[PDB]
Amino acid sequence: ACGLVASNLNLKPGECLRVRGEVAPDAKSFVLNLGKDSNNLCLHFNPRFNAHGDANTIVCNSKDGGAWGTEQREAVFPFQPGSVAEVCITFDQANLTVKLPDGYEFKFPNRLNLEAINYMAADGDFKIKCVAF
Amino acid sequence: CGLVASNLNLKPGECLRVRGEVAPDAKSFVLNLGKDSNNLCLHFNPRFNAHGDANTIVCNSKDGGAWGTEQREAVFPFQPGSVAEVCITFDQANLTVKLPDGYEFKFPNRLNLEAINYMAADGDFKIKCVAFD
Ligand SMILES: C#CCO[C@H]1[C@@H](O)[C@@H](CO)O[C@@H](O[C@H]2[C@H](O)[C@@H](NC(C)=O)[C@H](OCC=C)O[C@@H]2CO)[C@@H]1O
Numbered sequence: 001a002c003g004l005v006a007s008n009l010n011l012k013p014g015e016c017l018r019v020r021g022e023v024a025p026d027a028k029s030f031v032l033n034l035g036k037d038s039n040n041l042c043l044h045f046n047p048r049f050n051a052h053g054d055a056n057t058i059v060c061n062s063k064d065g066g067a068w069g070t071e072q073r074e075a076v077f078p079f080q081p082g083s084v085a086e087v088c089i090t091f092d093q094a095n096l097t098v099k100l101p102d103g104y105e106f107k108f109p110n111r112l113n114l115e116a117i118n119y120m121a122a123d124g125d126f127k128i129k130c131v132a133f
Numbered sequence: 134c135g136l137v138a139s140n141l142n143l144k145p146g147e148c149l150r151v152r153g154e155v156a157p158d159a160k161s162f163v164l165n166l167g168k169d170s171n172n173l174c175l176h177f178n179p180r181f182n183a184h185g186d187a188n189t190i191v192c193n194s195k196d197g198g199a200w201g202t203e204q205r206e207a208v209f210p211f212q213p214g215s216v217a218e219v220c221i222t223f224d225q226a227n228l229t230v231k232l233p234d235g236y237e238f239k240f241p242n243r244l245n246l247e248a249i250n251y252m253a254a255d256g257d258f259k260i261k262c263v264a265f266d
Pocket residue numbers: 044046052059060061068071
């Protein structure tokens with residue numbers, strides 16, 4: 001499903017983007033995309049509950065000029081179907097830092113050259129309740 | 134200009150809460166709501182000192198790119214250099230706009246929208262949080 005799209009976010013390095021949403025009881029996966037536009041993502045954040053052959057795995061990637069980068073997976077899955085979850089994201093030139101429920105945090109390399117994050121899109125089985133910038 | 138959001142999927146009776154910062158030198162700010170940028174059920178424009186108005190909220194609609202007839206409100210609970218929250222709901226007949234300090238007004242739903250999918254900010258108001266109830 002296609003969810004909320006925001007543009008002109010003007011999120012600068014060090015600033016925090018917070019997103020709170022409801023994970024569907026029968027959720028299979030959801031996505032938060034961040035970057036410049038739909039073809040230029042410094043972060044594709046994709047928790048997979050049960051999707052693409054994956055169970056309870058966070059998949060991350062980038063997209064540069066339409067081209068998917070090299071996927072990476074994380075080793076903690078602090079999401080439950082049928083619950084509210086918050087995600088908090090910042091960045092600097094080297095990395096995005098993703099803070100999750102249950103104390104967990106990880107970094108994903110920043111493979112694009114964006115001065116600010118201007119675009120966010122949410123998709124899949126996560127109903128956005130609040131965005132704070 | 135400011136934040137633009139699409140795919141909001143706001144339905145009748147649901148509450149959209151927008152918090153932000155009114156600039157210290159504010160002259161005017163805008164929240165636009167509707168289907169898309171050409172079809173606005175609400176152009177909400179507090180004018181501190183702008184476009185011929187002092188301390189007046191101007192409201193209008195836009196239907197297929199054409200501005201409607203302006204409505205001016207009777208109240209103005211905004212100050213430059215402050216934080217302010219605006220809360221909006223709608224139904225068949227009207228948008229209801231709840232303002233700081235207990236003020237509220239109605240603006241007719243001229244386009245008869247059954248969903249609000251688009252929001253945009255402009256002017257001397259920086260959005261800091263958007264919430265959906
Ligand atoms: C469009 C879109 C969003 O979906 C794709 C996106 O989530 C990317 C992120 O990298 O992954 C795509 O699926 C991958 C899948 O993750 C890969 N799995 C493994 C384990 O590496 C897969 O690998 C081949 C199988 C060993 O390739 C697919 C499709 O590209 C999402 O489709």
